Structure of Glutamate receptor 2:
Amino acid sequence: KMVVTLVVVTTILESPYVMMKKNHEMLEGNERY
């Protein structure tokens, strides 16, 4: 074939500021919180 030639945002779980979601285990990323 053609051959080539060569922001960390921290927080803590405190209500109502940061709370867990309902399906938190079934989500990933920033949508978990």
